Design a protein around this ligand. Structure first.
Ligand SMILES: Nc1nc(N)nc(O)n1
Ligand SMILES: [Zn+2]
Ligand SMILES: [Zn+2]
Lengths: 182, 189
């Protein structure tokens, strides 16, 4: 967390490992499945039951991944979505993931996004959003999605970002319920 | 870097977060926050800055500015930096955890939806704004789809909202960034 010449949030070995080991997950469920492997790695690593990762929309090349590091990280903005997006733009040398020349980018996340991440996804340059758990599922193990605009789906769809949900919802709920059990 | 989320801080901003400072009046706080806007514009950042202060002493805790382009991080808004460096200095994700004083977030402009959310989770009890949502939209920058009545939305969470403070100077710092935003060299910039 704390430094001075920088805002710095360190990552546990699995996340570091996920962001630096090559991986091509073509099918949507292959991406989501790997994202769920990370959620579980995260709990084991003292973090919230959320993970996400930016892949290139068509190939399924993993660019970056992120998990909740809010508590261990002392940073309320360290939602899975934020780190996965920001680490993706680091790796690609741009703040906009849809700058000319770059292959289309997808953020595959374990749960639907909270208001904050909802904004993050918009500015990010990402061209699609694939979720696992619904917002009900999320705000039924204690996590708050916050006041999003009515029709946040349409809001994202209305700027070149296509939304999908429920994908491997059940397996993601298994994961949610286990955390909430403990 | 791919080993940590790392947004680097320009020397002036390291200084801001280095040097102690107590600004009691709201105008005193917003004034410092707008020093940092023009300072940022001169360090390749966007026309936005923010600071976390102790609401009831005016002790500067931490400061932030748009480091989007130079940091290549669409998430690196002033608010996010200000709030995060405040959380890191104070050793907690929750700026309102027991033991810590009430925190205030002083921003040079009304927050976009992302930072609107950031505010809700930050821990801050109060957000003081300079430039109105309209002012920021006028020169291009997008606020994004904030929920209808986000202001009351925040106030309902015990987070107090104040906007338009030093709006004038805020507006002036916004236009001079615009007037020096193009690519053709204007030596006056
Ligand atoms: N409140 C909340 N919601 C989600 N989807 N993810 C996190 O990390 N927090
Ligand atoms: Zn979030
Ligand atoms: Zn913002």
């Amino acid at each position: 967390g704390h430094m001075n010449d920088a805002l710095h949030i360190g990552l546990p070995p699995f996340l570091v490992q996920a962001n630096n080991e090559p991986r091509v997950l073509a099918a949507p469920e292959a991406r989501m499945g790997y994202v769920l492997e990370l959620v579980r790695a995260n709990i084991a690593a003292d973090g919230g039951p959320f993970a996400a990762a930016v892949f290139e929309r068509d190939s399924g090349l993993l660019i970056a991944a992120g998990t909740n590091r809010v508590v261990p990280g002392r940073c309320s903005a360290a939602h899975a979505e934020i780190l996965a997006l920001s680490l993706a733009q680091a790796k690609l040398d741009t703040h906009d993931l849809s700058a000319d020349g770059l292959p289309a980018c997808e953020l595959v996340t374990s749960a639907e996004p909270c208001v904050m991440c909802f904004g993050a996804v918009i500015w990010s340059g990402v061209r699609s959003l694939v979720c696992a758990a619904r917002s009900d599922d999320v705000e039924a193990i204690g996590f708050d999605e916050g006041p999003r605009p009515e029709n946040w789906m349409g809001g994202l769809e209305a700027r070149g970002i296509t939304v999908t949900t429920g994908l491997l919802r059940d397996a993601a709920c298994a994961l949610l319920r286990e955390y909430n059990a403990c």
